[PDB]
Ligand binder design. Sequence first.
Ligand SMILES: N#C[C@@H]1N[C@@H](CF)[C@H]1c1ccc(-c2c(F)cc(Cl)cc2F)cc1
Ligand SMILES: N#C[C@@H]1N[C@@H](CF)[C@H]1c1ccc(-c2c(F)cc(Cl)cc2F)cc1
Lengths: 247, 249, 400, 405
Amino acid sequence: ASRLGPVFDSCRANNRAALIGYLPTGYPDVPASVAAMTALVESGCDIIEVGVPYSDPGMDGPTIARATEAALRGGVRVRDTLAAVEAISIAGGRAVVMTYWNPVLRYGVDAFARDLAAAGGLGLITPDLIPDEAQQWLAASEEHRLDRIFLVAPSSTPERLAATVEASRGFVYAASSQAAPELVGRVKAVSDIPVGVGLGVRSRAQAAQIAQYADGVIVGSALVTALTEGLPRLRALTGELAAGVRL
Amino acid sequence: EASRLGPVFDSCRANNRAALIGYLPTGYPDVPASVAAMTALVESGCDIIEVGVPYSDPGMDGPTIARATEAALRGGVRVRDTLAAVEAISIAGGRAVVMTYWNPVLRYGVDAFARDLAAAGGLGLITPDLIPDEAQQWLAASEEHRLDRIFLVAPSSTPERLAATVEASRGFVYAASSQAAPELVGRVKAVSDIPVGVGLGVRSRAQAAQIAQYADGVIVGSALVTALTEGLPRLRALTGELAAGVRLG
Amino acid sequence: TSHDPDSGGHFGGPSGWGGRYVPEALMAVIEEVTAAYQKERVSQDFLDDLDRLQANYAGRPSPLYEATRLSQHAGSARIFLKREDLNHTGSHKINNVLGQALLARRMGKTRVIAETGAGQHGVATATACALLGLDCVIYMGGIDTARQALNVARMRLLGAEVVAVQTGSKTLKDAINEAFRDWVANADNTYYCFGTAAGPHPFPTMVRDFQRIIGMEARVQIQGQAGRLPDAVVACVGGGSNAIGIFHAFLDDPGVRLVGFEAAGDGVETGRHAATFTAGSPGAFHGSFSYLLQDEDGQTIESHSISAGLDYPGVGPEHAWLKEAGRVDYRPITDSEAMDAFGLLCRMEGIIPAIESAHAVAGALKLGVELGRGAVIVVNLSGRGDKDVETAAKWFGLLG
Amino acid sequence: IAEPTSHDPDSGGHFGGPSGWGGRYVPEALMAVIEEVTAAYQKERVSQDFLDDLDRLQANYAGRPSPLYEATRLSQHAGSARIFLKREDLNHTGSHKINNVLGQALLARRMGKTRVIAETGAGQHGVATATACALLGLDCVIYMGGIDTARQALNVARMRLLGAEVVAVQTGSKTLKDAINEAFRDWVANADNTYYCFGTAAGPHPFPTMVRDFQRIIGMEARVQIQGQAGRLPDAVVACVGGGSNAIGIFHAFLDDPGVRLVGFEAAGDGVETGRHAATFTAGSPGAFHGSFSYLLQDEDGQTIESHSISAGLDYPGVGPEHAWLKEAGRVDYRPITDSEAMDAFGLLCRMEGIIPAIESAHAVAGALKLGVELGRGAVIVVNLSGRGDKDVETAAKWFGLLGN
Ligand SMILES: N#C[C@@H]1N[C@@H](CF)[C@H]1c1ccc(-c2c(F)cc(Cl)cc2F)cc1
Ligand SMILES: N#C[C@@H]1N[C@@H](CF)[C@H]1c1ccc(-c2c(F)cc(Cl)cc2F)cc1
């Protein structure tokens, strides 16, 4: 089974989807970001996406890209992300790391998987790593018992979607009007792996719309904006999002 | 048959002197003021007057003449103003030739310009950018209207072109230029007895005296324009000094 | 096909140079470009269309000139200049954009996007798009659009749109990132005309194949004028397109040295350089595994050079393979060295070189001193320096 | 091989009679160096060693032969005629002018001259001269109007980078025709060691013929290329006409071809009726100017009228004498093109073919489009694209509002 298997299992048994919240390490600073990720656990986040700020995030929207620019300006390091994963685990949370692949290559693919597992991390979301280049990652993924969350797109060919879902473990990230549920149907037609959907969820009503067909609701840009206004707004927005996934 | 300027050099040679040849451009500062200055040159001892036709692109002219002809054209000077100046110089009892680039003459009409200039009392024509190779129309018109043809020779002139240029000249030959000017006159006098005028940036009486030793005529132009810019009293004063310089005894 | 990568785009097998380090959202259009290229790569109608444009439109072949007055400054060696500066648009970049624009119309794409630094590749792309009737959008760093107003108007006169990128450091690196995001969203009707021999498969191979004509011509020309193969072939290396183009025909010649010269800026010891091989390290960047300038965590660091075309933190993966294989050596050339070669080429041969190309000339002078009298060195003069006259005038104090 | 001399002037440099066009309207102080240049050129124009040296420079250094490109996307605007562009824009330095300065600089070396002087309008020929002078170790001095030096700061530095010296002419109207006057005065003083590299097919003998010969390669190449690509001789060969060097260079190979129309297009500025133009043949009259008897813009007294054009290369009050002869003989027709017609063709060639032409060349392109409408579908017109427009981008951008305020 997968490390996140039990997480989605207790979600389906409660007639709800999983709330998956993203936050970048080191925004506005490293201690403040860890305090915010701990707040996500307290406020009802099932899975945490701890993002590694990268200097050239091509797949990141403007809100997240400007927060990782600020975090890098503040001097965030890759090891700071593993410190946040350790803090989230001690607080009873469940955390995966989302990062571009070059920081992993610089760290060492086997060494990063080892230290990520040793910090309590459960998986790795790789937006710019396709299974065709994941030879080293697949080996370290199995050796250290880590989930590998690959991404699929509305433009994925049937041969590539099946191959990408076959290579995934834990859940499949489906990134993008009705193209999001159609993409989820293509995955569920070839495998029974949970599917996460993140299209810029913004309110409680939007979280329920995705939760009608997706196993996990991925929220990222909205949590960063809430954290900019303040920490109390983050737990308030996360509270509204936690109520939407149960509807 | 003798040239129009022939008897002038004969008389100058008899009095043991060189001819003083003065240049002034028509219409500087204005047309009446230049005519008054050309008249003053006759009154002050100029044997021959060079009446310059201002031209928009005068390559052979120095900076003093160039700025003076620019100002004359800004004032709207015309080619016919030069013919009127020749009339005034003839009326004042002087002798005038016209120095001009060839395009104004071509525009006016070569035979027509020779006719009207000869009528106005003109004696000859100085052509700084007309070599004998292009002077077929001009040779015919100068013979028709009894006008002297003053071509130019230079220190760099080949022995063949120098003889051809002297052969083609009537009146006097213009030698335009350390020791280049006397050597140039020696080359002309080695093949002909035609009078030779020397222009050399003459500016004082002593310079005119040096040239009068070996040349038949002393040509002064830039220094006269500079003096006219000061005024007619300064121009009369300078012309008297130059008239004294050409006289050797 | 002897020096080509595998189906995944990897040079050297287990080393893994190149590949496709892109998101899945872009793999459909990349497989579409790879299939289209491998189909037209062997179509005679495509090769005939390209040859007609190269000859009648771009001015190929470019000449090979022996700069005899440079010899006394190159240790009495013999410097031959591959005159890519005489191409249409003024550089070797016209070779790449003619092949990709022809391919884009074979694919049915109606829109072409391209990155650019100070404007050379953007002008070339707009030139090819106007020629073939393609909608063209150029992405340019906001810092570059502010001080390159005439190159912008140049692309604008050619009928292309120009977008100033204000994200990131607002330069060439960030313009590529923005064209990437554009291509992800518009891959149905848009083709990405990349400007150098990097990026994901098949772009490093495809661009090299389009630049191969430089080396093929230069190898025929040098044997005709000198009677033998050269002792060395040198070129400047930014992303690597003009270098790999002239290097490729000589790869299997045992006696021919291949030296690429990269921008060292103020010096490699100063952190204000662009020497990717001299001071960089392997990593994944812009869709390929190659060398780049990065810090201890793998973040892209800023590059500095008086050249615009060599002001790039990365380098093509096939060059990283040739460096590992020991076939090509890569040496640094500083700003000062390049400008001395710039002015020397102006005073000695009357050729005003692109400041990028002057790095190759400067390295050729140093290499001619090493090899001695009579040595034959072919130098790829990638571009002309009309775009750089103002920069060079300030350098020598001829302005004021 | 030395090409024949069927259309040459007489020994005095006169076209169509011993009192026809051309000749030498220069002072005697200059005839020594002109007879020296004439003798040197007549010896070298038939020297196989000289023609080999020039061919070697034209091929490996200048980039010749230039291609002949059929601008298919222009046909719709040219009455469905077929427009072929002689791509002189691809020459080294970017214009046909490199053909002229290479031969004359080689000739200056053959003569033992060590110093070369030249005029320039907005900088194009001065850069070309300085280029050849750097290549052949000659000292270079460029004369340029003070108005043009202040307005063309980069071309001055371009010439200094090439090792040349620039002198600002602050006399007269301070432009092209006054830089020529200053270079002429320099030659009279330094003829012993100085060669005057004149920039067009005008001036005294032998310069109209010599400049024409160094540009005849354009027409020789084009006449072969047009037969290979079109299968027949063209219906018309056209080119822009400033002084006339690029036009006469492409015209010459087609002179004895009976059915090939020859049309030169001159700059009409704001319009021939507005007095702000440079249409020498259209609004000028015969006269002697800059050493030759030809056509020039002059008033009733024979004074030179200032010329105006949005292009700097066609901004010249005169024209070469061999063109005046070909006009009188009826071989070549000369038609005007305004600033707007040229800029319209400038932008069209940019959008349709990706070629940014020199504004001088845009006049020829504009006239080719008009000629294509007159000649109709299928007509084959060869256009001399005399230069590239990188120098004219700033002017064209202001014209099309691409710079704003
Ligand atoms: N994920 C991701 C990354 N954000 C940046 C750094 F890796 C972004 C990126 C991805 C791809 C490219 C790319 C390119 F440069 C050229 C071509 Cl032809 C195709 C491409 F797909 C560029 C930047
Ligand atoms: N006299 C007289 C005239 N002052 C101006 C008008 F004609 C001056 C002049 C004379 C000659 C030339 C000339 C030239 F343009 C090119 C060449 Cl190659 C040789 C030349 F000699 C130019 C201007």
